[model samples]
Target: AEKFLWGVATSAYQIEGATQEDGRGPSIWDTFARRPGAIRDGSTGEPACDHYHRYEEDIALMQSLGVGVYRFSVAWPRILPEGRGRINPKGLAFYDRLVDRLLAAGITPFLTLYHWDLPQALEDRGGWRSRETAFAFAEYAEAVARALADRVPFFATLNEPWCSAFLGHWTGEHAPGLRNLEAALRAAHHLLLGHGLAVEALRAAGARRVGIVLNFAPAYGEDPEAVDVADRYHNRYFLDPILGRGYPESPFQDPPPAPILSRDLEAIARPLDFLGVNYYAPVRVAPGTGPLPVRYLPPEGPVTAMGWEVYPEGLYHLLKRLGREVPWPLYITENGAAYPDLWTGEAVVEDPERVAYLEAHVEAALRAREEGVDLRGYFVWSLMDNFEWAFGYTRRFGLYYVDFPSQRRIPKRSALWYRERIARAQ
Candidate 1:
C-alpha cells in the first residue's frame, strides 16, 4: 500500500478553457456543444475553470493534496490542429510547461493521449468510423510521446473508447453524435485499431508505460442471458480483444458489426505494461428486444447527482474478477461520484456524500488488494469541477469547488479527507 499511487484525473476539454487560444484548433466538442440542445445547460467548454491559464494554481492545489501522481489528458487538436498534418508549437508548449510545473511540484504526470476531443477537421473526414482516422490517431500519439514521454512516465493511449464509440455514435449523447448502430460498430472497431496503433507509436517514441483506460460499470441482471449480453457488449467487447481473447460473441454479431482484418487482433492485443480500469457504478439490465435487446433497469440503491447508483461492493467484485482474468497490473484510474454540493456561507463547499462515497470505494479497493488483487493505485475521477460534458456544469465531481464566475477554487470537505488519507498512507 505504501507504493500505491494516489492521484487525481482531469481531461483537457473538461477543464482547460482557452479553446481557441495559443493556436488551438476546434475539437469536436467545440462544434458539438454549439448545436442547440447538445449540452444540457446550453454551455460549451469555452471558460470551463480556465485551467489553461491557471495550471500553476491548480498544481499548487495538487501539491497541497500530497498526491504523487496527476493523471491528465492532452488535447489532440492542441498537438495536431487538423489531427495529422500540422503541429502547433504553442499547443505542445502549453503541455510542456504543464508537465514541467507538475514535476516541479513533485507530481508524476500520467498523460492520456485522447479523451474524446477529436479535432473537428477529422470528423469531417468520417471521424473514428474510417480506418484512416486510426492512422491519424497514431500520428498524433507519436507526436505527443516524442515531446512529453521523456518526462511523463505513464501514457494511456485512449480513455474509455466505449464512450467514444457507443455514447458518441449510437446513443448520440456526446460529440460527433450519431444515432446509427452500424456506425457505432464501425467506430468501435476503428477505435480499437487506433488504440493498437497508438500503442506502437508511443512505444516507438520511447514511452515507458503504455496502456488504455476503459470505463467499466459491471453489468447485473436477474436473467443470466440478459447479463451475459450486457457484459459481452460493455466489458468483453474491448477487454477481450486487448487481453488476446479476440472479440466475444454478442448481439452485434448478427450481421457482423465490422470487418476484423488480418493481423488486427495481434496489434490490438499488443502487450500492455498496465491496464487502467475506471469504475463508477454498476448497470442493471433485463431481457429485451430491438437493436440491443437489453432493457436497462433503474438504480436500486442510493443515486448520485449523475443518477448513478452508489455501489462500492461492485468495485470489489470487479477488481477480484479482473484479478482472475487479467495478467497485467491494474490501476483504478477513475472512480468518483458527482453530488449536488452545497456551498456554505463560509468560503467552503460541504459534500458529505462524496466523502462517504470515496471512503467506501477506497475501502472496497483496499479489500480487493488485501485479497491479492494486483491493484497498483487509484485516481479520483476528477481534480475539480469543470464542464461535465453533455451534463455541462450541473453535475459537480470535484474535490476543489470551482467558482466559475471568478475561477476561484475552494476545497470541499472531501478534499481535506483525501489529504489526510494520502498523508497517512505515506
Candidate 2:
C-alpha cells in the first residue's frame, strides 16, 4: 500500500434517514420496508441514523479516524425525485455541500452513484427489467455528474449489482422483491448497462476517475464442475463482461428473455481506471437440481454475527485471481464484519472482535499486494452502525456504535484500532 488510501464506505438509504425531507422522492427500499414483515425488526429507514441531518458530525468523526478517503453514495431520489427529468434542487444541494465539507477536511470523496436505492418511480415503470431503465439511469447519472463531478475524485457507478439482481429479484431479500429467475437475469444485465452508461457520462463530465464496485466471495465446490458453475454464477457473472471479456455462456440452458444489444456490451467493456472488489467470505457450493446447478453449503468456520464465515484467506486468493484475469488495479471497496457489540454502560463501546476482524483482513490484503497484486486501497464496510438491509438494525458493522434513540455516536475499540492502522500507513 505504498500510495494506498484508507477509508470507510457507506450508502445513502442505509444511513441517510431523512426519507421525506428536502424534496427527496421515495426509493424502492422506502416502499419495501413499509410492507409488513419486510424488515426483521418491523422497521423502516425513516430515521436511519439520520445521516442526512447529521453528516457534519459524521465527517468530523471520519476526520478523527485519520482516514484519507470516504466513499458514499448519492441517493437517486434525492437528485431527481422521480428518478429522471425533474431535478430536486435541495437534494442536489445537499451533496454539493457534502463534497465541499469533505474537501475542506482534506478527505478525498469517492462517490457511488447507486447503492440499491433506485427511485420508486423507475421501479413502477418496470425498473431494471426493462432496457428503458438503463437509459433512464444514464440521464440520472449525467445529472449527478454535472452537479458534483468536479469535486469528487472517484465515482463508482454501482455497488454490488449481484445483490441488486440476485438477492433483490431472485431471492426476495431486498427491495423491489420478485422471486423470478428471468427478472433477475434481466436486472443483472441492466445494472451493468447502467454502470457502463454512468462511466461514459462521468468521463464526459471530466471526472477524475470512474469505476464499479463488485462484491466477491471466492467459491469452492464439492467437485471441479460444481466449482465452475459457482464461479460463473457469483464472480464471472459480472466480472467477465465488465472487464471487456464477453459474458461467459449462461449456466442455465433456459436463456433469459432480454437479449443484450451489441452496443450495450461494447459500453459495458469500456476501459476502467480501477476496479473495486468487496470481499466478505468464501462460498462453498455443491451441485444442485436448479437451472444453475449450484447449491451453497453452510459455512463451517468461525462466523461473524451475520453468520458469514471468517475467511480472510479468501481475500488474498481473490485479489490474486482478479489481478491475473482482469488486468486492472483493485481496491478493497467493502471488507468488515458485523459483531454483536454492547456498550459497557459507559462512554466506550468495546468491540475487540471487530478489531481482530480488521487486522486479519488487512493482513490478508497486504499479503496479496506483496505477491504482486496491484491493490491500491482498503475501505472498511461502514462508518457507523445504521440499517443492515433485510436484517434491519439487527447487525452492527461499524467502528462506531450508533444509539438509535439519542443518535449518539460512540467509538468502539475497532475505531481506535483502525485509526492507529491508518496512522501507521500514512
Candidate 3:
C-alpha cells in the first residue's frame, strides 16, 4: 500500500488498428463500426494510431514520461481469432515483443484480458448474453495468462463489465448494439461470470496478481427511492455480486431471470489481490414512470469535451466509499478528460484544461489517500489520442496528442507536467 503506481492505459481496438493483419480476426467492434452511421465520421478503427506497428515508439514515449507501469489490453481476436480452438502465433508474438520491450525499458506491464473488443466469432455464438461465453472467456484467459503470466506481473480480467453489458446492450451505443432490457440484464450477469471465470483461469495459469477493473459513476437523486434504485442497478449491480454481497434487488421490471449456476456467486466473489476502479463523473438520476424506473439527469458543471461533468470531488467520494466497502487494495485504473486539442501544426500542443483536470483529480486521490483509502495506483485513460469508440477519433483523452493523418504523436503540456509530477513523487 505504500507504493503508488503512475501509468497510462490503452485498449486494443481504441489504439491498435491492425484488425486484418498479424493473424488477427474480426471483433464485434469491426462489424459494429462498419454498419452505416454506427461511428462518428464514418470511421472504422482503420489507422487508430497504428499502435500495432508503432508500439515500440509508444513504449519509448512511456519511458520518456518516467511512468512506473504501462497498462494495455490484449485483443481477444488477436490471440483466438475464431474465439476458440485455433491459436495465433504471430498475434501472440507481437505481445511477446511488446512485453519484452516494456521490461527492457524498466517499466512494469499491466495486462488486461478484455476491453469490450469481443471476437465477432464469439458474438455470432451469442456473446455475453450467452452463458457459454463466460466459459469461453475462461479458456481465452487461460491461454493468455499461460502465455504472458511469466512476464506480466498484474492481470486485470476485464476492463469494465458494466460498459460491456449495459452500454452495448441496453443503451445501444457501443458494439453489439441492441436496445433490449432483458438482453442487457442477461449480458450483465454473464459478463461478471466471464470476469470470475477469467480470474480463475489466470490464477490457475500462475498469474501473480489477478483482478478486474470496474467503473464507478455514483448515481445521485433527490428522491431516496430513485437514488437507491439507480445505485443498485448501476453501481452496486456488479460491486455487490463481485464482493460476495450477492446481486442487489433488481430494479428492472420483468428483468431477465438471474443467470446463475451452482456456486456461481462464490466463484464471482473469489479473493482478489487488488481491485481497479475507473472513475470519470458522477451521474444524477431521477425517478421515471416509463420502462426504466430511474433516468439519468443531464450532468451540470464545467464539462469535458466528452460532455462529462468535471467533478473531481466525485473521485475522492468514490474512493472513500469503496475503501469502506471493498476490503482489498484499490487502484485508479483509468481517469482522464477529453479536450478539444489543437495540433496548431507544432511540436507542442498546449492543453491547459487537461492539465488542470489532471491536477484536480490527482489531488482528490491524494486527499482520499490521506483519509485512509488504500489507493495504490493511478493510470490515465490513455497515453495517446486514438479512436474513442462511438465518438470515433473525435474525442482526445491522451496526454499525448496524436495527429491521425500522419500518425504523429506529440506530447502535450500535460505529458511534460505529468513527467515532472512522477519525478517529484519518486
Candidate 4:
C-alpha cells in the first residue's frame, strides 16, 4: 500500500465573513453575494460561521484531526484595500496568528495568493480581463510573500484559472460576471500572466516552493463521432499553455480566438515547480448544435449526494494523461464531494456518501502513485463547507459539519475516519 500525504483546503472569502471590519475592504464576492438570485439560497456569506473570529478554533480542529497540511488562501482585498498600496496591519496580524497556529500545531500551511476573490477596486478597474489586474496580482503576491513567506515557504499563485475565466466571464456563474468567450479567453490569458508574474514576485520575496492549482477533468464524447475532437480541445486547452506546448490543435490553435493579444504565450508559460489539480468527476462533452461548439452533460455511474458521478477511475485517467505532458510534480489540491449531511444529534453526524467518495478517490490517487506519476500530495476538496459561491450555504463540502444556524461545529464521521488513516500514515 502506498502512503500518501493527506490534507484539506479552504479559502478566505468562503469562510471568513468580515466584509468590512479590522480594516478589511469589500471583495468582488461581497458584491456578487448581493445580486438577486446570484446565490441559490438568496443568502450572502455575511456572518459565515464567524470564522474570521474563530480561525484559531478551526486550526485546532485541523491539528486534532491530524491533517498534515492545511491549504488556505489570503484575501488580497482584506490585506490591501485598493488591491495595491496601504497594507493593512490588522489584516496581516490576523494571518500572522493563523500561520503561527498552524506551525505550532505542526501542520504545514499551504498558502495560495489568489482564489478568484479580486479586490472590488480592482474589478472596478478592468479586473483580470485587463492587463492591469495581472500586475496588481503580482504586487499583492509580493506583499504576501514579503509578510508571510518565512512561515509559509510554499505558495500557489491562483487556484483555478478556468473557473476564474469560464465561470466568471463566460458563464457568469461567479463574480465580476460577464458572458463573452473572447473576453473569457482574454481573462484566461491574463490569469496565467498573473500566475507567472506572481511566481516571480514570490521568488523575489524568497519562496522556494511555488506553484498553481487548476481544476480539470477527463472529457469524453457521447459516441465515436466526437470522441477525439471533444477530448482534444477541452483537456488540452488547459494543459498546452501550462505544460509549455503554448497551444494545441483546433480553434485553440491557428489564428486563435478574437482579441488575441500579443505574445501572451511567452508571459503565460511561467514554469511551475508543481501543479495542484482539483478533480471531481469526468465531464462528457459533445459538439453542440447551440451557439457554442461544445456542450457538457452528466457523468454516468453511482452518484454522490451532490449528484456528481462517483467515478474515481476518471481521476486515474486524468492523472495518467496529464503525466504524459511535462512530468511536473502534482498534487490533488481539491478532490472531495458534498453530501446532504444531517445531524443525528447535537454533536454527531455521519456521511457515508462522503466516505465512499473519498475512499474511491484515495484508491485512484494510490493507483497514480503506483504508476510512477510524481504525485506528492492529495488535499481533499475542502476542510469544511463554508460559503459555496453562487450556491450559498446550501451545498456542504466539509469533513466537519457546520450547523450554520447555530454557528455550531460537529466533526463528521469522515473527519474521524480521515484522522485515523492520517495518523497511521504519518
Candidate 5:
C-alpha cells in the first residue's frame, strides 16, 4: 500500500464537450448520437462538462483530491481530422496546455490514446474493420507521443477494444454501430494490430510506458461448461493474444472469423510495461443454445444504477487471476458505480451508495495486493458526472455532482470520502 498510486479517469468524448470547436472534426459518436433513438436520452455530447474550456478547474479538483495521477484520453479526430495525414495545430495545442496544467498541479498525466471515439471519417472508410485504420491509428499515436511523451509517463494505446469491436461492431450498441459477427471479428483483429503499432510508435517517440486498457467482467456460474465458454469469449479472447498465448478457441474461430495476416500475432504480443484492467462487475453465465452458447442472468445481490451487480469479491478474484496469468504490473484503471444521486437543493449530493461501492471495491483491491498480486494503482471511473454514451446523461458515476444546465460541479459525499481515503494512504 505504501507505493500504490491513486487517481481518477475520464475519457475525451464522455467529458470534454467541445465537439465542434477548435477545428475539431466529428467522431463516430458524433454521427451515431444524431441518429434517432441512438442515445437513450436523445443527447449528443455537445457540452457534456465543457472540460475543454474548464480543464484548469478540473485539474484543481484533482489536486484537492490528492491523487498522484490523472488519467484522461485525447480525442482522435481532434488531432487528425480525417483520422490520417495533416495534423491540426490547434487541436494538438489544446492537449499540450492540458498536460502542462496537470504537471503544474503536480499530477502525473496518464494518457489514453483512443477511447472508442473513432473518427467519423475513418468509419466512412471502413472504420476498425479495415486494416488501414490500424495504421492510421499508429500515425496518430506517434504524433501525440511526439508532442507530450516527455511529460506524460503512461501512454495507453486504447481503452477497452472489446467494446470497440464487440459492442460497437457486433452488438450495434456503441458508435459506428453495426451487427455482423464477421465485421466484429475483423474489427477486433484490426484493433489489436492498431494497439501493437501504437505501442511501437510510442516507444519510437520516447514514451516512458506503453500499454492498453481492457474492460473485464469475469464470468461466474454453477454450470462449469457454460462458465468456461463465457470466460473464454469474454475474458481470454483479448487477454490471451496480448500475452502471447494466441486467441483462445471460441465459436467465432470455427470457420475463421477474420483473416490473420502472417506475423500479426507476434506484433500484438508486443511487450508491455503495464496493463490497465477496468472491472465493474462479473457476469453470471448459464447454458444457452446459440453460437455463443452462454446466457447472462440477473444479479443475485444488490445492483448499481446501471444494473451491474455490486460484487467486490469479483475484483479480488480477477486481480489474483491476472497476477497468476500475466507478468505485467496491473492497474485498476476504471472502477466506479453509477447511482441515482439525490441532489439536495443546496448544492449537495448525498450519494451513500457510491461511497459504499468504492469502499468495498477498494478493500477488495487492497486484499488482492496483500496476497502478492502485482497491483500498482487504482483510478476511479470518473472525476465528475458527464455523458454516459448510449445512456447519455441518464447515469451518474462521478464523485462530483455536475448540474448539466449550469455546468456547475458540486462535490458529492463520495468526493469527501475519497479525499480522506487518499490522505490516509499518503
Candidate 6:
C-alpha cells in the first residue's frame, strides 16, 4: 500500500446513447423504458448525454484530472447485435479506440462485462432467471476477451447483480420488470453463475486479472435486537457466497421470510482477483414485523441532493469488516453523490457539495487505508453527470457537468479539487 490509485467510473447504457448507431441492437432497458410507464419522465435514454459522440472530450477530462484508472462498462447490445451468436464489427471497433485512448492518457482500464443492460433478445429467452442466460454470457465474455484482453488490466463480469436481480425482478422498478421473490432469487443465482462463467472465459482467453463488482453498503440494524439479526442475514446472504464460504442459510430458514437459496452453496462462492465495492451511504437496518429479518432505517444525518445520506464512516466500516471477514483486496469502485449543480452559459459546472462529498469520503478512505484495511483503489461513481436509472438526468453526480441541450461539457470545482489530489498522490 505504498501507492494510491484514483479513478472515475461510468456505465455503458447510462451515457452511450447512439442506441441505433453501429451494429447495436435493443437491450431490456431499451424495451422496458418504452413500455408506456416504465420511466418516470415518460422518457427513454433516447439522447442521453450523447456520450457516444462526446467520449473523446470526457476522456480528456479524466486524463487532465491525473486519474490513474478509468472504470467503465462495454454495452452488450453494441458488441453483440443479437446477444449470443454473432459479433458486430462496428461494435467491437468502438471499444478498441476507447480502451486505446485511455491507455494513451496513462490511465489504466477496468472493464466490466455486464452492467444491467441485458439484450432484450436474451431476456425473451428467460433472462437471468434462467441458467441459459449465464451460459450465453460466457460466450459473450469469450468473444470480448478474444478481442480486447491485452489492453484491459481488470475484467469484471457483473456490476451490482443484486440490483440486476432483486431490484429488477423483485422490486419491478428496473428493466424487464417482474416482481416475484422466487424470480428474484433465480435471477440472483443466475447472475453469479454468469459472473463465474465469464471469469472462466476470461481465464481461457489469457486474462491475468478477473473479478466481480458488487455495489455494497455497511448495513445497520434498526434496533439492537433487530440489527444483530439483520447483520448476520443481510451481509452474510450476499458476502459469504462470493468469498468461497457459500451462502448463509440460517436467516433464510425462518418462516414468512423463507427465501431459502437455490443451487449448491458453492455456486455463490466464486474465486476472484479482486472485489469492487461501491459504497454510497450507510443503511440502518432492523428486524421487520413482516418477517424481513432486517429493514432499512432512514438517515438521521445530512443527505445529498439525491436524498441519499452522506456518511463517510460507512466506507470505513465496510472496508474493515470485509478485510477482517472475507480478506479480499477491495476497491471503492463507486463512491460519489448527486447534487444540485449547473452547466451554465459558459458551460462551467459549479458544484461545491459534490466537492465536499469527495473530500470527506476520500479522507475517510485514507483513514481506513491507514488502519490496514487492504483497500487497493478508489474510483468515484462518475466523472460526468449522466442518466441515473429511474431518476433520469435530474440527478447530477459528475465532477464535470453536461448541458444536455447543447451537449456542453463543463468542469465543476470538484474537478479541480480532484486534480490537485491526484497530482499530490502521484
Off by over 4 Å in 1: none
Q: How accurate locally, in lDDT, is each candidate?
A: 0.91, 0.89, 0.89, 0.81, 0.92, 0.81
**lDDT (tens digit, per residue) of candidate 3 on 138-160:** 99999988888999999998888
Clashes, model 3: 0
Better of 2 and 6 by TM-score: 2
lDDT of 1 by residue, 1-426 (tens): 348999999999999999899889999999999899899999999899899999999999999999989999999999888988989999889999999999899999999999999999999999988899999999999988889999998999999999999899989998899988888889988999999999999989999999999988789999998899999888888999999999888655356565687699998998998899999999999999877889999999899988899999999999999998998899999999999887645566887999999999999999999999999999998989989999999999999998898898999988999999999977
Q: Which ten residues in a row have the lowest lDDT in candidate 3?
A: 253-262
TM-score of each: 0.98, 0.98, 0.98, 0.94, 0.98, 0.94
lDDT of 3: 0.89
TM-score of 6: 0.94
Q: After superposition, how far is residue 86 of candidate 2 from its true place, in Å?
A: 0.4
297-391, model 5: which lDDT tens digit per residue?
Answer: 99889999999999999999999999999899999999999999867466668878999999999999999999999999999999999899999
Q: Write the per-residue lDDT of candidate 4 for residues 204-238, one digit (tens) a residue.
A: 99987888888776767766445555665556666
**Tens-digit lDDT track for model 2 on 24-126?**
9999999899888788998888698999989999999999999999999999999988898899999889999999999999999999999999999999998
lDDT of 2: 0.89
Clashes of 4: 1
- Which pairs in model 2 have colliding backbones? none
Pairs in steric clash, model 3: none
